[PDB]
């Protein structure tokens, strides 16, 4: 006996109604179904049990309904605070694949900064250039590493934040790591950023020695 | 007012036995089930098993039942999960929680309370590797004039080449929380996690307020502080 959630992914502007489905392989009584909100880095919390009985202390905008095999978590009006992944489970507690819920919002352009490699890290024989994309939306963006106007590959590596629970923007970090031998055979280390919120792509760059 | 926290080894070697312990800190185990839920690095909440508080009845995910046993010391108020023959598959954050319907007590015939999972609590990460731990090398992300964008400046620390997760980064010993994005670690092809952590602050405060990041890596008993200066 199994448990099927859908959609797997859901991007909705703040304040709109969101509907989440959890579908059993079989007939089940209301009692054994429960809903869980799992914000990233917190511990997962009970939203609802016995399919409709609201958990203690969780707001009214979370409503639960259903019978038989189609169970339905309803967010009547999304608050940005709802960015999470919402799971469901049966009695002896096995399942739910969940539903990652963005908060869709306005296009917001990233603010960009570069940081040169530190004096301390250069003494160890490795140079790291870090490029920053801060508080932007929608999630997708392009970082292009340009070293004396030449493109990089495979020695840049990047990470992006989980969605900010209050203004629903994303922040991104692209780190270029080279050995000091490589860092010094070029002069100008440049980071070019492409995003919806940016008219044309922006480039922030320094010349080795500053 | 119940509350609980899991803890355990920060690392396990291949083919060993992984254990994790959960300690109930607001009430007793009395008349409840206690269950274990794992979240692998990319996946959702895999259920592992639960055990009745008194230890007579338990149920587990049959994928793991052969290599899983869960016990509870009603006196110590702690529950132990014991997963044999661990592989890097089992590399995951292990969550601990409290099963259900009010639980209610049952005989040996009918164990017919089980309904919901209330308090969960952060639970603990267990990497599983034959590698040996390494310490962070913390450097400054200096707010140079290429990090001066009008009246706001950005600055941070680089936390490079460590193992295994986690590290804790804090700013000015907990004082600074606004404008903090401590990024996710990125597992390099070397096998090592690496991470920056940034804070944006007013340009005017650069010469008045000093900024120091507090990196902490319990798997190597590394704690460094690094001042950020021009």
Author numbering:
A (entry chain B): 2 to 27, 27A, 28 to 210
B (entry chain A): 1 to 52, 52A, 53 to 82, 82A, 82B, 82C, 83 to 100, 100A, ...
Paper's wording?
To characterize the binding mechanism of the new antibodies, we determined the 3.1 Å crystal of the unbound SF12 Fab and a 3.3 Å cryo-EM structure SF12 Fab bound to the clade B B41 Env trimer. VH gene segment mutation frequencies ranged from 17%–25% of nucleotides (21%–39% amino acids), and VK gene segment mutation frequencies ranged from 15%–21% of nucleotides (20%–29% amino acids), intermediate rates of SHM for HIV-1 bNAbs. In addition, SF12 shows an intermediate rate of SHM compared with other HIV-1 bNAbs, with 21 and 19 amino acid substitutions in the heavy and light chains, respectively. Moreover, SF12 uses a long CDRH3 of 23 residues and a relatively short CDRL3 of 6 residues, while VRC-PG05 uses a moderately long 17-residue CDRH3 and an average 8-residue CDRL3. In addition to being isolated from two different donors, SF12 and VRC-PG05 arose from highly divergent VH (VH4-59∗01 versus VH3-7∗01) and VK genes (VK3-20∗01 versus VK4-1∗01) (Lefranc et al., 2009). We conclude that the SF antibody family achieves substantial anti-HIV-1 neutralization with an intermediate degree of somatic hypermutation and no evidence for autoreactivity.
Env is a trimeric spike composed of gp120/gp41 heterodimers that has evolved a plethora of immune escape mechanisms to evade antibody recognition. SF12 recognized a glycan-dominated epitope on Env’s silent face and was potent against clade AE viruses, which are poorly covered by V3-glycan bNAbs.
